[PDB]
Amino acid sequence: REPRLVGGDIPCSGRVEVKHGDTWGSICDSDFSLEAASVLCRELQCGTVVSILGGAHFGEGNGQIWAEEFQCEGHESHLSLCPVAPRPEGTCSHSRDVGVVCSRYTEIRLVNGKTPCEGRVELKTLGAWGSLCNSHWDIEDAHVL
């Protein structure tokens, strides 16, 4: 049960899609809960769940819709380990696709450095890339980057 976020402008948000072995498909607003979104952000390493948005917030999928309902308890590391309750078809349409916004929205990269480890710090906000400022740039931040 492999998750994926598609359609979002910022790094850790978009439509929720789960692969059942070899096929990608969307999920309903009703089937997805807060516990499942907690696992999805954790599995994808996107932090913690900030919002759950329904009604095709990031667009409508084009494909198959999974009818099963996840029953995560919130502490699982992957969606594969989550117990799943099967449901019949016909529950939703594609205008009721679910979306998730997780917390790690920051976009940072290192440029103009030959070694990928060293370079100039750059940050993306409001759709553009820019350079940071020297003030309040200590070694604690550089350790985390």
Partner 1 sequence: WEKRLASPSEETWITCDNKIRLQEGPTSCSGRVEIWHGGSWGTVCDDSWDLDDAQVVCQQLGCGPALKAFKEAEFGQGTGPIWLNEVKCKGNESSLWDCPARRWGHSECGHKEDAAVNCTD
Burial pattern 55-93, b for ≥16 Cβ within 10 A else e, equals ebbbeebeeebbbebbebeeebeebeebebeeeeeeebe
**Residue window 30-69: x/- pattern of binding to partner 1, with contact defined by CB under 8 A:** xx-xxx--------------xxxxxx--------------
- Residues 98, 73: Cα–Cα separation, whole Å: 19
The smaller minimum CB distance to partner 1, of residues 47 and 54, is found at 54
- Residues 70, 73: Cα–Cα separation, whole Å: 9
Name which of Ca ion, partner 1, none residue 141 binds, using a CB cut-off of 5 to 8 Å depending on partner kind.
Answer: Ca ion
We find the least distance from the C-beta atom of residue 90 to partner 1, in angstroms, to be 12
Among 138, 142, 143, 144, binds Ca ion (CB under 5 A): 138
DSSP 23: -
> Where along the sequence are the contacts to partner 1 (CB under 8 A)?
29-31, 33-35, 50-55, 74, 96, 98, 101
